[PDB]
Paper text:
FGAR-AT encoded by the purL gene is a multidomain bi-functional enzyme that catalyzes the fourth step of the purine biosynthesis pathway. The FGAR-AT protein from Salmonella typhimurium (StPurL) has 1295 amino acid residues and is a single chain protein with three major domains. The C-terminal glutaminase domain produces an ammonia molecule that is consumed at the coupled active site present in the formylglycinamidine ribonucleotide (FGAM) synthetase domain where nitrogen is incorporated into an FGAR molecule converting it into FGAM. While the FGAM synthetase domain and glutaminase domain carry out the two enzymatic reactions within this bi-functional enzyme, the function of the N-terminal domain is not clearly understood.
Data sets of the xenon bound structure of StPurL were collected and refined using both native and a mutant version of StPurL R1263A. This mutant was analyzed and was found to be structurally identical to the xenon data set of the native protein (2.65 Å) and diffracted to a higher resolution of 2.18 Å and therefore, used for further analysis. Five xenon atoms were located using mFo-DFc map and confirmed using an anomalous difference fourier map. However, only three out of them were buried in the core. The other two xenon sites occupied shallow hydrophobic patches on the surface of the protein formed by crystal packing contacts, therefore were deemed functionally unimportant. The first xenon site (Xe1) was found nested in the hydrophobic barrel characteristic of type I glutaminases in the ammonia production domain that constitutes 24% of the total protein. The second xenon atom (Xe2) was located in the FGAM synthetase domain, trapped at the edge of the hydrophobic barrel formed between the two gene duplicated halves of this domain. The third xenon atom (Xe3) was located at the interface of the three helix N-terminal linker domain and the central FGAM synthetase domain. However, X-ray crystallographic studies revealed that none of the three internal xenon atoms were trapped in either of the proposed ammonia channels within the protein instead they were bound to select hydrophobic spaces within. Therefore, it is likely that the compact fold of the protein results in very few surface exposed hydrophobic patches leading to only three internal xenon atoms being structurally trapped.
Numbering used by the authors: -7 to 447, 466 to 1295
Write the structure that this text describes.
């Protein structure tokens, strides 16, 4: 396959079939649905290699072999009409960046670029050219892809354009008109006074502005970048106001500075953490060690609402990716640890599952549907978190779309433009919290990805998470140098690209800069200087480093394979210049104070609109019907489709994730991580939000968001409320009638009143101020406007991660007690209950009593510390009804509760969404607990409800009357139906159905353990005691992310864990000949492009020296190796080097066709595995996190031979203890539950689950109560140590 392509040659290589049978069946069913009459469809990947020089035979064999990957689906002879789908010309897929990288690291420098498309073969012998266009429309994404008729057309993707010159705007030759034309032509969106400012600036300089200078200015001065609304002066109902919104937020720091180390002067806030062992590999020795020191806590939350309305997968992916850059660029370098995720969208209207409150109102053609956002968006957000390697541990998901009588009268209110929210916490060293001095002469570097023309095609983002992982490793090497950290100053690259980030950086240091345009790394030679300087390409940071640290920085980057460029120098003069060596001229030449000068402050002069509620019309409402609808509201309903798609175990520090208890029910109210791998100190995150309340009462909605963040985090051991710090993220349709006054009133409500009075700081925050959508529907104008939507995220240092309560009810003798901080108001306005009957109602919840909310929190903290709680679940969407139901789902039990003391209105008592929740206590503690609550002023809020009982009965009485009684299993399965329907349409429907149907089986005993050995016996102790510590090579390739906890597991077992990067082996810095033990760690090397683990394995196989090195290590008589997850995939690709491995299977795309992050039950089976000695017959859960873990054999003969040889070491079992292939008990579809195999001599074991994630009991999502510090998985590492003797 090989043809001229300008001054290069393009080779075409056929790949493998691209779609599984159920995917083919969906295409055919959709074609029949549109009646396009299609007899058959078949699809095959095809690869395109643009070559700068020819391949000899052996290089050609290498290239072909690199492009063999993926499940072994049945080939077909091409037949019918070819439609080839590729990335749009002018764009380079992330697949292409990563695959070309593999090619280069396998020695194929002749490969200039690799790209991939899908060839579809459609047999539909009479369709009009018209119907052909609809077939083509159906097979590609119009925002990213194009459809071609010939394989040869792929040459269009590799055209090199000449560099486009700068363009000047003729102000001197045409006057102000030139600026007006450029404003419209370049879409600068400039205000009249901004046009005046530019006109005057350039008249003063006596020369025309260049397009690049105007664009840079336009970006810096957008609402998005300047925050004009948040800095504006206000007049409200005729009275000037004393403070901006930002100054009201700051008020919370003026009033509670406690524990804050950094607020409002960085792209994250920082608060005090805990002195613990920070674990990392020394720069000199490569050995991992604990460094006992403060691990302070940074936090940040951001949105990506507009781009997600256009292209939701990269919109959500880069929302997370951008936020992750903020966290690593805090101070002088910091480390992201865990993430959170939020979505608000309009009604799903799932086909065949439409709910009675949903009405189709239309939408703009150019945006995607709510369903499309909730399909592709969570996948994009998880793709980044999974491929970058941070666990995603808490989040919210709301649907809202209704015609409502609100502040501006009857209007459509919703989320056509969605909220896509991404946030997280990380750790930072004390001495790096402060940005450093920028020395005159400092080198100014771009760290990260080559620029492309990115940033409405302009709203289609692009993510490459692996590129960002490689940058994070360099930032980690830097801060891991302590006082020798060479980062003087670092900033993320986001809006405005370099044109914002570089000026901001020098400016923050009191300097200017001089830059060379042609030093910036670019994958698009056609780009204009404007495009190069201003594009929003992803995975970039800017930093300043002293000239003499450049050789160190260079070494650090090269070992990580993180690209970087020196692109300029910091100057004493406060000027900004950008030179271009190619055109020999100066695209930018400005004083900074001209560039960064501001037009006058905004004034908003506005008036209050307040909705008068309508009383809830109850004609159609019964309690039973209300329970059924409310559990079908996606806001309320089970969230599994948002949770198991995202890793929750990488770092080995996750103590509490969303899934709770033996039945792994996602109801955890907040996330908890341990502060290190050697401590019980930790960090917690929770979310509060209640946007629909803002349709009745702006300030109540903001108070409730703060209050729910607190009730969600309250059963975690924190102590002083001033330890809890908030992000406030404000989404509004600024300018829409009544929203501006409501915004000022809501910010005041929290910043000036509620938070100072509770002792809560808001040291970080952001705002997104055009939350609305307009389009033409008949030839009527239509508009969908969001409620004011405050999202509060709460972050806190944790005193003891072991003491966290979850909603999992005990059935030992117990009391359930409601804490009703609604004080009997029982408001029903703006509840899930109102919304599911198409109403807004009358009067919403609110914070009823500030002393009692603080009293609530302090009481909860006293009960958590004294271990007086069995369970906790707060009340929010769905009310007390949903809180009790979710506790019964998590406990897999019944409730017998009486509500007579809660008012005569049972509907109001069950469904109000007032603050509070239900604690469960031992029956014998009930009196002391009620006395404790009374001491905090709560007696009149506290109500004994009844008890949790074994069994399936969910019973609510009022005196002698049954208010509501149903099977708990029935409610649990209704509550599951949304995630079932989402999984069924997104993933393999067979796996969605199995998962859902297992829920209806009440006899399910949940995760449960059988141990064949003593989990507390440290069999490595006599070896550790001698002080003899053998090395283990902790092997990582670029994109590996689980190596730190892997090293820590081996360390606890007595090893000296050495960081061995593949670059170390390629560069000769490490030899395997010096090791007896090797482990290949997990993650996403090369983003799994070319098959998970393949580029890592082939880069070994195709370098003869490193390959000989691996083969020698494996052939030694006493070496031990382990491969986990990515390392298990890598090693299965290395069988030719491993003796005794001939029967090993391949590991390919899970049968569900979805990444699976699960806490799965396995049994240890009889094999030669030396790492599993003493464990055979044990059954216990383990962390699973993979999308390519399905064992695939050549045929049954290979499966039988593998089995009969006795080499299977681990199998998935269902909770009844049987070997299974039913999902998700077996999360990936592996035959015979196979998930680990060993070699004939037992010296090498590979497995897909992560024992290193869960070797600490505290890091097991569920575990038996009596376990000590060590989980059963700790024994694998101790077995390695004892085996080496
Ligand atoms: N978008 C999301 N991504 C990840 N996890 C989520 C998301 N939405 C909700 N969750 C998790 O699902 C569980 C139930 O969520 P939800 O009912 O919104 O919480 P609550 O009602 O306690 O505020 C929680 O553990 C939450 O963290
Ligand atoms: Cl169709
Ligand atoms: Cl702009
Ligand atoms: Cl939009
Ligand atoms: Mg103090
Ligand atoms: Mg909920
Ligand atoms: Mg909650
Ligand atoms: Mg919530
Ligand atoms: Mn009151
Ligand atoms: Xe190719
Ligand atoms: Xe400017
Ligand atoms: Xe956390
Ligand atoms: Xe108590
Ligand atoms: Xe090992």
């Amino acid at each position: 396959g090989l043809v001229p392509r300008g001054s290069h040659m393009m080779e075409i290589l056929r790949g493998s079939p691209a779609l599984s049978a159920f995917r083919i069946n969906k295409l055919l069913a959709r074609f029949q649905a549109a009646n396009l009459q299609v007899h058959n469809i078949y699809a095959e990947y095809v690869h395109f290699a643009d070559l700068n020089a020819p391949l000899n035979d052996s290089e050609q064999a290498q290239l072909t072999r690199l492009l063999q990957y993926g499940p072994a689906l049945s080939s077909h002879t091409p037949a019918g009409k070819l439609l080839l789908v590729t990335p749009r010309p002018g764009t380079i897929s992330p697949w292409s960046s990563k695959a070309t990288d593999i090619a280069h690291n396998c020695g194929l420098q002749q490969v200039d670029r690799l790209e991939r498309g899908v060839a579809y073969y459609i047999e539909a012998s009479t369709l009009t050219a018209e119907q052909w266009r609809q077939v083509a429309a159906e097979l590609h994404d119009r925002m990213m892809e194009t459809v071609f008729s010939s394989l040869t057309d792929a040459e269009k993707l590799f055209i090199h354009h000449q560099p486009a010159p700068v363009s000047s705007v003729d102000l001197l030759g045409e006057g102000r008109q030139a600026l007006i034309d450029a404003n419209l032509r370049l879409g600068l969106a400039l205000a009249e006074d901004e046009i005046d400012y530019l006109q005057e600036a350039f008249t003063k300089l006596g020369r025309n502005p260049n397009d690049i200078e105007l664009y840079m200015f336009a970006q810096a001065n957008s609402e998005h970048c300047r925050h004009k609304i948040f800095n504006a002066d206000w007049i409200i109902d005729g009275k000037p106001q004393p403070k901006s919104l930002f100054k009201m937020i700051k008020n919370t720091f003026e009033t509670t500075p406690d524990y804050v180390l950094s607020a409002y002067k960085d792209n994250a806030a920082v608060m005090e953490g805990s002195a613990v062992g920070r674990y990392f590999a020394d720069h000199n020795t490569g050995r991992y060690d604990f460094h006992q020191e403060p691990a302070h806590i940074l936090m940040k939350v951001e949105t990506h609402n507009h781009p997600t309305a256009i292209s939701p997968w990269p919109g959500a992916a880069t929302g997370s990716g951008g936020e992750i850059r903020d966290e690593g660029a805090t101070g002088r370098g910091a480390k992201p640890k865990a993430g959170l995720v939020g979505f608000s969208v309009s009604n799903l209207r799932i086909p065949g599952f439409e709910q009675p409150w949903e009405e189709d109102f239309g939408k703009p053609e150019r945006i995607v549907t709510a369903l499309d956002i909730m399909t592709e968006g969570p996948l994009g957000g998880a793709a980044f978190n999974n491929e970058f390697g941070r666990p995603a541990l808490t989040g919210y998901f709301r649907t809202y779309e209704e015609k409502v009588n609100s502040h501006n009268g009857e209007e459509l209110r919703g989320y056509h433009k969605p909220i896509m929210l991404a946030g997280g916490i990380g750790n930072i060293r004390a001495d790096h919290v402060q940005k450093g001095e920028i020395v005159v002469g400092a080198k100014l570097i771009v760290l990260g990805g080559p620029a492309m023309n990115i940033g409405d095609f302009a709203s289609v983002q692009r993510d490459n998470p692996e590129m960002e992982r490689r940058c994070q490793e360099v930032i980690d090497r830097c801060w891991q140098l302590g006082d020798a950290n060479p980062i003087l100053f670092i900033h993320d690259v986001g809006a405005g690209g370099l044109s914002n980030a570089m000026p901001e950086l020098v400016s923050d240091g009191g300097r200017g800069g001089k830059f060379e345009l042609r030093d910036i790394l670019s994958d698009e030679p056609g780009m204009s200087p404007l495009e190069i300087w201003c594009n929003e390409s992803q995975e970039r940071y800017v930093l300043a480093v002293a000239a003499d640290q450049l050789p160190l920085f260079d070494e650090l980057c090269k070992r990580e394979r993180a690209p970087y460029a020196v692109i300029g120098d910091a100057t004493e003069e406060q000027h900004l210049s950008l030179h271009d060596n190619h055109f020999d001229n100066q695209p930018i030449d400005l004083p900074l104070d001209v560039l960064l000068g501001k037009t006058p402050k905004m004034t908003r002069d506005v008036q209050t609109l307040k909705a008068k509620g309508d009383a809830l019309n109850r004609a159609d409402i019964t309690i039973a019907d209300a329970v059924k609808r409310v559990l079908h509201l996606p806001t309320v309903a089970e969230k599994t489709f948002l949770v198991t798609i995202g890793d929750r175990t990488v770092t080995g520090m996750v103590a509490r994730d969303q899934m709770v208890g033996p039945w792994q029910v996602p109801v955890a109210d907040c996330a908890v991580t341990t502060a290190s791998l050697d401590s019980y100190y930790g960090e917690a995150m929770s979310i509060g939000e209640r946007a629909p309340v803002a349709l009745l009462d702006f300030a109540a909605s903001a108070r409730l968001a703060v209050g729910e963040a607190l009730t969600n985090i309250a059963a975690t051991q924190i102590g002083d409320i001033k330890r809890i710090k908030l992000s406030a993220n404000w989404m509004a349709a600024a300018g829409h009638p009544g929203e501006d006054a409501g915004l000022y009133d809501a910010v005041k409500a929290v910043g000036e009143e509620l938070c100072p009075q509770l002792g809560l700081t808001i040291p970080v925050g952001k705002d997104s101020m055009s939350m609305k959508t307009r389009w033409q529907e008949g030839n009527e104008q239509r508009e969908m406007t969001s409620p004011l939507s405050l999202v509060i995220s709460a972050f806190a240092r944790v005193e003891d991660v072991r003491h966290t309560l979850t909603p999992q009810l005990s059935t030992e003798d117990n009391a359930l007690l409601l804490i009703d901080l609604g004080k009997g108001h029982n408001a029903l306005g703006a509840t899930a209950l109102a919304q599911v009957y198409r109403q807004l109602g009358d009067k919403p919840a609110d914070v009823r009593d500030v002393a009692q909310l603080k009293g609530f929190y302090d009481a909860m903290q006293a009960l958590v510390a004294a271990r007086k709680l069995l369970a906790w679940h707060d009340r929010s969407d769905g009310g007390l009804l949903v809180t009790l139901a979710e506790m019964a789902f998590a406990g897999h039990c019944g409730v017998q509760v009486d509500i007579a003391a809660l008012g005569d209105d049972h509907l109001a008592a069950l469904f109000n969404e007032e603050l509070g929740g239900v604690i469960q206590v031992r029956a014998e503690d009930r009196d002391a607990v009620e006395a404790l609550l009374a001491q905090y002023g709560l007696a009149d809020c506290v109500h004994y409800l009844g008890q949790a009982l074994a069994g399936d009965r969910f019973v609510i009485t009022a005196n002698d009357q049954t208010v509501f009684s149903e099977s708990r299993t029935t409610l649990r399965v209704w509550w599951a139906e949304t995630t079932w329907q989402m999984q069924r349409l997104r993933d393999n429907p067979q796996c969605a159905d199995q998962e859902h149907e297992a829920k209806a089986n009440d006899t399910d005993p949940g995760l449960n353990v059988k141990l064949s050995f003593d989990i507390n016996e440290d069999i490595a102790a006599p070896y550790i005691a001698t002080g003899a510590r053998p090395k283990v090579a902790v092997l990582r390739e670029q994109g590996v992310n689980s190596h730190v906890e892997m090293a820590a597991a081996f360390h606890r077992a007595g090893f000296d864990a050495i960081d061995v990067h593949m670059s170390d082996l390629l560069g000769g810095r490490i030899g395997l000949g010096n090791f007896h033990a090797l482990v290949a760690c997990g993650g996403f090397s090369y983003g799994d492009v070319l098959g998970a683990g393949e580029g890592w394995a082939k880069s070994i196989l195709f370098n003869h020296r490193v390959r000989d090195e691996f083969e020698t290590f494996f052939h030694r008589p006493q070496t031990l190796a382990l491969g986990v997850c990515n390392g298990c995939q890598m090693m299965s690709n290395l069988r030719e080097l491993i003796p005794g491995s001939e029967l090993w299977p391949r590991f390919v795309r899970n049968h569900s066709d979805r990444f699976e992050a699960r806490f799965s039950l396995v049994e240890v089976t009889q094999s030669p595995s030396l790492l599993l000695q003493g464990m055979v017959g044990s059954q216990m859960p383990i962390a699973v996190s993979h999308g390519e873990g399905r064992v695939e054999v050549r045929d049954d003969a290979h499966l039988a031979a593998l089995e009969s040889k006795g080499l299977v070491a681990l199998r998935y079992v269902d909770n009844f203890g049987k070997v299974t292939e039913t999902y998700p008990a077996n999360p990936n579809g592996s035959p015979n539950g196979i998930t680990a195999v060993t070699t004939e001599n037992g010296r090498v074991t590979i497995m897909m689950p992560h024992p290193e994630a869960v070797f600490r009991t505290v890091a097991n999502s569920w575990h038996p109560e009596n376990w000590g510090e060590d989980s059963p998985w700790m024994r694998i590492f101790r077995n390695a140590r004892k085996q080496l003797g």
